[PDB]
Amino acid sequence: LLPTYEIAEKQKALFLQGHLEGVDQELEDEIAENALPNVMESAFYFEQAGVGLGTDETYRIFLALKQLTDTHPIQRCRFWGKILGLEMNYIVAEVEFREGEDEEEVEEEDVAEERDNGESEAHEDEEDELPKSFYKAPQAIPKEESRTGANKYVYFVCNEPGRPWVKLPPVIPAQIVIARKIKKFFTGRLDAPIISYPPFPGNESNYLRAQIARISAGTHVSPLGFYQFGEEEGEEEEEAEGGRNSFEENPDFEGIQVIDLVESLSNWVHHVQHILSQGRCNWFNSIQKNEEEEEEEDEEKDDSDYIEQEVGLPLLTPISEDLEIQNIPPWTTRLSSNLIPQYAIAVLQSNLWPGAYAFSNGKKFENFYIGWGHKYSPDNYTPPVPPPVYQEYPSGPEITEMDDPS
Amino acid sequence: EVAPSMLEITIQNAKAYLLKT
Amino acid sequence: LEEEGENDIGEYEGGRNEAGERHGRGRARLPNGDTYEGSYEFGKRHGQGIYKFKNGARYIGEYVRNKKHGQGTFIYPDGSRYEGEWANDLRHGHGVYYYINNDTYTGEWFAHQRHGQGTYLYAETGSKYVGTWVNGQQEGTAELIHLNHRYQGKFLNKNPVGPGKYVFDVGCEQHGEYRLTDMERGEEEEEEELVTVVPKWKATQITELA
Amino acid sequence: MDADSLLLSLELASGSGQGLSPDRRASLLTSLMLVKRDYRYDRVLFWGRILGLVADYYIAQGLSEDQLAPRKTLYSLNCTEWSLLPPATEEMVAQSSVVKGRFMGDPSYEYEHTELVVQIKEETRLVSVIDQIDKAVAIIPRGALFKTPFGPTHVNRTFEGLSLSEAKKLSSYFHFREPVELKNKTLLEKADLDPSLDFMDSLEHDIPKGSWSIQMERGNALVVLRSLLWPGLTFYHAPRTKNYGYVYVGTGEKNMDLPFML
């Protein structure tokens, strides 16, 4: 009894058409129209690019997205890519859900916040009181809301085609900061803890979500003019602090020539919002206190508690302005075949994230990460230094023992 | 006990292979 | 505050010797608002006692001639505390400091400073710096141990230096070196330009556990 | 990764996603058998692809009658024009060890390093990177080669492929080079090994431990061994057949963060 047969009996669930003898054709018409990506055409174009999986694995994920789209009410889907691992790889799909059908997690924070105010009552001993610590811990950077920022794109991950897909947990700004500060493999199991320095507040599923978001924020690129900002009428006075977080596909996209897409880096524009060093896509002020508390602290505000607003790159940025990795261009452009300029397609290679590739035949494009999910660095990944030891309470008169009078 | 020679080990391996059914 | 008012004695409840000085176990309220409860000798503190300061600071331990001595626990008003030996109102010997954010330092002490061998555990991360301490700065051969790994090598001014190796629990070691690299020129306000010495790891070989 | 079954090798090693274009695939298929006659090689192995910033180095090697003999390295920039490469020495590696980063893609490009200014070519860097990968993460299954008592090592014509149990074990895969740790092995360990089959160093004792991520693509009908010391390396094995081979598609940089990574 071989594991070749175990996948074979698992994948035949994909290959076999379901026994839908009694399911309405109108319901089948409403389902099988707009919920699917052209993974198969993408892999051929990435086969033109010199990357991508083989056919048989691509058609198996092409099957796996059918059962995924049939089980869940998916509005739009795209094959995000494949992140390899120690025991098994991860097959990742980037999707968008329908309105009003989201499985909202019903307030898991309501339980965690009610386990610290355990006041002890009815104990009368009014001597030897402990000096209470004035250390207010720095505020944890709040998670981004659904359909916004790094949490805008929902990701499902399956180990193999024919296996059930599993929902990735949403990503945390503390997770992204630590995921940048660490560098670990994936073990093929999402329940494996990330045992690293600094410690990751989550399992491998949270680290996979953080790595995918970091790849998406810096590799997902589109041809210039493919995507355009929506023309919202009436919001001309609210552009001071909030950037444009929405984009739409341009119906008038005639198309950039492949030779222009290769010779010029500026014809490729990113289509996913950048993740800040705070760990968000939109900056949050951790010092913004309540208005009822600000009215009494306006006379002793020091100049050491200001946090500079982390402003990242906006939407639709050319890849030529991405940071050069020690005079190395962050993106590699080449033709799919140098002997033919007419049916060259614009092979784009992410030097910042090895394994991330984007094609363009002139009109169609996709982004596709097949790697290990790790950021390229010219030097070593240096583990962080131990934090500096906090300075002890100074030995002033309140620690110097007052002398004994006669 | 003297360790068996490589010639003797190959002889035992050859005898056992011919004893395979 | 150690300049005694020789005429301002303050309140005292306890025994006295033949010369009128305070002797034996007694409780004294000093004029600075501080309180003491412990044994006395010739009008001076000796033996076990508790000195509670005005702002919330408090020492529990032994005293020798108006000076803290022996084993003692001082709980500072910021919520931090120290438990260990004392000598002439100074942190001395082996002792444990619990910091303001549950950080735990355990090791030797010398003149209110971290000295000798010491283990500093960061509460937020869980990493422990085990090694030699010189004037409260990371120095000498030391181990930064965190979870599944430990770096074994040298430190200098909280910036680890020189050759070293990382030992992981999976069965491997990574031999390399730390190079003190000075590329961060702070554009901050013009106050005491701090050379932010950034140590960079440069590995040379990877070995198994022998 | 034989040239005769290069198309099958590329289709099976495409599970790592780092395939090749049909332009480069058919150019490789034709050019390896051209290099095979032009230098009179017994067998030709496609080494893989070293990615660059402008062009990609396509590397392949040729072998003599002795399978353990030093092989001859050739490289290309468009899978058509193949140029030979010089062998590496100790001074060759010691110079090239100080260069870090990705390859530019131009063989005449030169890297400058300050020693306490040494000029180090990219073709100089390419040769050492190829030889460092060849000495470290080369894989051959057990029983693929047999060593005659006369000294030369030949391809075992009776090799039917590894079994299903042996394909899941790291000890059944051996380094495709001369033994190093086998000489340091004791006589008691030498008594249990076949001199004609176990004459190489096994991947079980590879330094560091856990450097191989062995995986079951299509359920161990294809056995995929991905190197963790060198990212982008994928070795495919099909049990009960003669299909085997390894391909490196990457930047040619060692993962010396591997203790940090595991």
What is the full DSSP assignment across A357-392?
EEEESSS-EEEEEEE-S----SS--PPPPPPPPPPP
Q: What is the Cα C168 distance to its own chain's centre?
A: 29
Chains A/D: 3 or more C-beta pairs closer than 8 A?
yes
CA nearest to D202, candidates D176, D230, D173: D173
Burial of D87 (0-12, 13-18, 19+ CB in 10 A): exposed
What SS3 state is found at A340? coil
How far is it, in rounded angstroms, from Cα D217 to Cα A84? Answer: 12
How far is it, in rounded angstroms, from Cα C38 to Cα C45? Answer: 8
Strand runs labelled E in A85-145? 90-97
Nearest chain A CA: its distance from C135 CA (Å): 12
What SS3 state is found at D164? helix
Residues on chain B touching D191 (C-beta within 8 angstroms): 3, 6, 9
Helices within D49-191 (DSSP H only):
90-96, 122-136, 164-167, 181-184, 187-190
Stated as kind and residue range, the H or E segment containing A109 is: helix A109-112
Q: Are C208 and D262 a contacting pair at CB < 8 A? A: no
Residues on chain D touching B5 (C-beta within 8 angstroms): none
- List the chains bordering chain C where 3 or more Cβ pairs fall under 8 Å: A, D
- Residues in chain C, overall count: 210
Q: Are A4 and D220 a contacting pair at CB < 8 A? A: yes
For residue D215, count other CB atoms closer than 10 A to its CB: 21
- Whole-angstrom CA distances from C73 to A136, A392, C86, C98 are 24, 14, 9, 11
Secondary structure string (H, E, C) spanning chain C? CCCCCCCCCCEEEEEECCCCCEEEEEEEECCCCCEEEEEEECCEEEEEEEEECCCCCEEEEEEECCCEEEEEEEECCCCCEEEEEEECCCEEEEEEEECCCCCEEEEEEECCEEEEEEEEECCCCCCEEEEEEECCEEEEEEEEEECCEEEEEEEECCEEEEEEEEEECCCEEEEEEEEEECCCCCCCCCCCCCCCCEEEEEEEEEEECC
For residue B3, count other CB atoms closer than 10 A to its CB: 10
What SS3 state is found at B9? helix
In this structure, which amino acid lies at residue A59? Answer: Y
Identify whether the C-beta of residue A34 lies closer than 8 Å to the C-beta of residue A75: yes
Residues on chain D touching B3 (C-beta within 8 angstroms): 191
What SS3 state is found at A289? coil
Query: Hey, which residues does C208 pair with through a beta bridge?
Result: C172
What SS3 state is found at A280? coil
Strand runs labelled E in D170-231? 173-174, 212-217, 222-227
To the nearest 10 degrees (0 to 180), the angle between helices A3-15 and A55-71 is 60
Q: Give the CA diameter of chain C.
A: 77
Identify whether the C-beta of residue C4 lies closer than 8 Å to the C-beta of residue A402: yes
Q: Are D15 and A54 a contacting pair at CB < 8 A? A: yes
Instruction: Identify the experimental approach.
Output: cryo-EM
Identify whether the C-beta of residue D14 lies closer than 8 Å to the C-beta of residue A54: yes
Identify whether the C-beta of residue A267 lies closer than 8 Å to the C-beta of residue A256: yes
Q: Does C9 touch chain D (CB under 8 A)?
A: no
Residue to substitute from A134, A379, A393, interface C, most C β-carbons within 10 A:
A393
How far is it, in rounded angstroms, from Cα A385 to Cα C180? Answer: 13
Exposure string over A156-193, b if 16+ CB within 10 A, otherwise e: bbbbbbbbebeebbbbbbbbbbbbeebbbbbbbebebe
Q: Encoding tokens for residue A326?
A: 């020690």
- Window 166-225 of D: residues touching B by CB (8 A cutoff) are 191, 195
How far is it, in rounded angstroms, from Cα C201 to Cα C180? Answer: 9
Contact residues for A260 (Cβ-Cβ < 8 A; gap 6+): A267
Specify the residue for token string 């490196």.
Answer: D248
To one decimal, the resolution in angstroms is 4.1
Burial of A321 (0-12, 13-18, 19+ CB in 10 A): exposed
Establish how many alpha carbons lie within 13 A of residue A315's alpha carbon, considering only the half-sphere containing its beta carbon.
20
- Window 12-31 of D: residues touching B by CB (8 A cutoff) are none
Q: Give the CA diameter of chain D.
A: 56
**Which among C166, C203, C206 has the least Cβ separation from residue D207?**
C206
How far is it, in rounded angstroms, from Cα D22 to Cα A49? Answer: 9
Q: Are A183 and D21 a contacting pair at CB < 8 A? A: no
Q: Encoding tokens for residue A110?
A: 């309501």
Residues on chain C touching D212 (C-beta within 8 angstroms): none
